[PDB]
Design a protein around this ligand. Sequence first.
Ligand SMILES: CC(C)(COP(=O)(O)OP(=O)(O)OC[C@H]1O[C@@H](n2cnc3c(N)ncnc32)[C@H](O)[C@@H]1OP(=O)(O)O)[C@@H](O)C(=O)NCCC(=O)NCCSO
Ligand SMILES: CC(C)(COP(=O)(O)OP(=O)(O)OC[C@H]1O[C@@H](n2cnc3c(N)ncnc32)[C@H](O)[C@@H]1OP(=O)(O)O)[C@@H](O)C(=O)NCCC(=O)NCCSO
Ligand SMILES: CC(C)(COP(=O)(O)OP(=O)(O)OC[C@H]1O[C@@H](n2cnc3c(N)ncnc32)[C@H](O)[C@@H]1OP(=O)(O)O)[C@@H](O)C(=O)NCCC(=O)NCCSO
Ligand SMILES: Cc1cn([C@H]2C[C@H](O)[C@@H](COP(=O)(O)OP(=O)(O)O[C@H]3O[C@H](C)[C@H](O)[C@H](N)[C@H]3O)O2)c(=O)[nH]c1=O
Ligand SMILES: Cc1cn([C@H]2C[C@H](O)[C@@H](COP(=O)(O)OP(=O)(O)O[C@H]3O[C@H](C)[C@H](O)[C@H](N)[C@H]3O)O2)c(=O)[nH]c1=O
Ligand SMILES: Cc1cn([C@H]2C[C@H](O)[C@@H](COP(=O)(O)OP(=O)(O)O[C@H]3O[C@H](C)[C@H](O)[C@H](N)[C@H]3O)O2)c(=O)[nH]c1=O
Ligand code: NA
Lengths: 145, 145, 145
Amino acid sequence: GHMIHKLADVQSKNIGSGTRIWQFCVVLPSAIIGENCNICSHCFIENDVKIGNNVTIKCGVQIWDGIEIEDDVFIGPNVTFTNDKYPRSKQYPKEFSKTIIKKGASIGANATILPGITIGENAMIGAGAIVTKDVLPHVTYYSKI
Amino acid sequence: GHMIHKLADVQSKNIGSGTRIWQFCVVLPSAIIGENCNICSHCFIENDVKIGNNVTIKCGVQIWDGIEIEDDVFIGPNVTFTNDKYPRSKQYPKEFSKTIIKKGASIGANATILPGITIGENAMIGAGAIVTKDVLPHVTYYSKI
Amino acid sequence: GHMIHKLADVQSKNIGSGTRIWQFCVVLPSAIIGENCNICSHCFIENDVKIGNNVTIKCGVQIWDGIEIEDDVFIGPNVTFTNDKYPRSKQYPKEFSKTIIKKGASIGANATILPGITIGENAMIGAGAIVTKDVLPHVTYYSKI
Ligand SMILES: CC(C)(COP(=O)(O)OP(=O)(O)OC[C@H]1O[C@@H](n2cnc3c(N)ncnc32)[C@H](O)[C@@H]1OP(=O)(O)O)[C@@H](O)C(=O)NCCC(=O)NCCSO
Ligand SMILES: CC(C)(COP(=O)(O)OP(=O)(O)OC[C@H]1O[C@@H](n2cnc3c(N)ncnc32)[C@H](O)[C@@H]1OP(=O)(O)O)[C@@H](O)C(=O)NCCC(=O)NCCSO
Ligand SMILES: CC(C)(COP(=O)(O)OP(=O)(O)OC[C@H]1O[C@@H](n2cnc3c(N)ncnc32)[C@H](O)[C@@H]1OP(=O)(O)O)[C@@H](O)C(=O)NCCC(=O)NCCSO
Ligand SMILES: Cc1cn([C@H]2C[C@H](O)[C@@H](COP(=O)(O)OP(=O)(O)O[C@H]3O[C@H](C)[C@H](O)[C@H](N)[C@H]3O)O2)c(=O)[nH]c1=O
Ligand SMILES: Cc1cn([C@H]2C[C@H](O)[C@@H](COP(=O)(O)OP(=O)(O)O[C@H]3O[C@H](C)[C@H](O)[C@H](N)[C@H]3O)O2)c(=O)[nH]c1=O
Ligand SMILES: Cc1cn([C@H]2C[C@H](O)[C@@H](COP(=O)(O)OP(=O)(O)O[C@H]3O[C@H](C)[C@H](O)[C@H](N)[C@H]3O)O2)c(=O)[nH]c1=O
Ligand code: NA
């Protein structure tokens, strides 16, 4: 079985064994979430979303349509994803940009990921980074101060 | 009519037709929100706040006292506004700084807007930018890495 | 007495007189919170956490295990703390890194604080800063654009 907090709104049935979804989360019906994930408080997870096994999503994260998270990924608190490069209110793209966070990668707290980004297997993104280009597998990337 | 989610705390009656306010939002009594807005999950909207028509506010945004959003604005997820330049706990300003986001402007995800800022009509703020100065109409501004 | 909003999940009994905890907050049982604090909507406060008196925590803040906030601190909205320098999903540190925010300090909106950080008494952190090193008492630090 899986644990959905009474104070979460989880509409998806596609949730693996051992997954925990905490207070004040929203998960829309088509989201797929694997086994032994931890979806911490105050997250939003849209429809066209795939999340693998053993994924940690810390508080305050939104996973939009077009985002895939592979197995063993860590997403730090308040990490921000995007799916529209030139957003204008009520101008809906024909297709959302796809982001994929590959197996074992980690995204530091409060990082911002631009649309269409690939972060490679076991990469490490520094806290507060802005990721405007793909990050190669096993690379440590941060936005220098 | 307008749609207020049962899991939102909306205290304002000043909400235009076609507006949607989603889960875990707080809207205080004096907030004014126009028609056909989308206030996504996990937002906070204070009292001395004016929001126009056709405004998109993505998840995780707080709109403080002193902030005005004009029509057709897009506010990306986790965009942060401010109204106190030198904040000290329990030292309440006599007047909050005013921010105005002008018609059709778009603010990228996880941008930070300092107090007293004007963002001009149809401007585009890059994801993760820090906006310390006014942005002219139709200008694309981002914080270079 | 103290004020816990009906839409908060506060599990701690260790809350001082005059403290307000607002909608959609989570506070875990061992958290200690002093007198006359304001914990604004959408915050998360873990177990191994000490918060002093007269502390303002604006919306969207998570205070992790290992974080201490002293008296009279201001924490701006969406300020992000961290306690694990090299996070990997399901790889739990033997010890979390400790952060201490010293008396009267202020952290600007949407700042990111790396693990193990001391911010000195009455320091001022700019909105959107990334704090990778200790900040001396009374110093104004921001990440230049
Ligand atoms: C990026 C990193 C992994 C790198 O650590 P590291 O490789 O040991 O780098 P380092 O040796 O500490 O620092 C090297 C330099 O980069 C800077 N730096 C490190 N992290 C940075 C960041 N996130 N942004 C900007 N600069 C950074 C340091 O200030 C240092 O600068 P100087 O050489 O000028 O002193 C780490 O700092 C980090 O950001 N970790 C993520 C923490 C996090 O978000 N955890 C998840 C939340 S808690 O579970
Ligand atoms: C700012 C921008 C509109 C600009 O796109 P653009 O004008 O096509 O710029 P670009 O040609 O992609 O990039 C030009 C340079 O600026 C950099 N850049 C682009 N966006 C940046 C940002 N947000 N912060 C820092 N640098 C940025 C690129 O890395 C590139 O650098 P090099 O020239 O060194 O390669 C876009 O990158 C962006 O930030 N969009 C907002 C996305 C968003 O937040 N959407 C809302 C959430 S989803 O609805
Ligand atoms: C850091 C500061 C306290 C400094 O204000 P200040 O010392 O008067 O600096 P300033 O004179 O305005 O600006 C000096 C320079 O630093 C830059 N700057 C100021 N704040 C900055 C920030 N947060 N990040 C990057 N640059 C910043 C300015 O752009 C200016 O650059 P130029 O000299 O190139 O013009 C203020 O800008 C700030 O960040 N305040 C926090 C606001 C906040 O988060 N409030 C809490 C939420 S509302 O309660
Ligand atoms: C009890 C409870 C937990 N949670 C979430 C947030 C807690 O931080 C988290 C605890 O679960 P866990 O021990 O499996 O922690 P993880 O979420 O796996 O994160 C910890 O371990 C990582 C390796 C990193 O070091 C990270 N910084 C840590 O927080 O679960 C809620 O959101 N609400 C709750 O009520
Ligand atoms: C069903 C539901 C929706 N919502 C919010 C968040 C969803 O992303 C949003 C969907 O409404 P919508 O289709 O009108 O989307 P918008 O909010 O208008 O944003 C989309 O379109 C923009 C032009 C940009 O491309 C943006 N990146 C997109 O997300 O509504 C909730 O918060 N909770 C919910 O339960
Ligand atoms: C009524 C209500 C208030 N609150 C929180 C958020 C409101 O901003 C806050 C109001 O309490 P307060 O007047 O004691 O304000 P503070 O939280 O102390 O912050 C204000 O004063 C500071 C010195 C800075 O200038 C800051 N920018 C201001 O917002 O309480 C909720 O989260 N939900 C609510 O329903
Ligand atoms: Na943020």
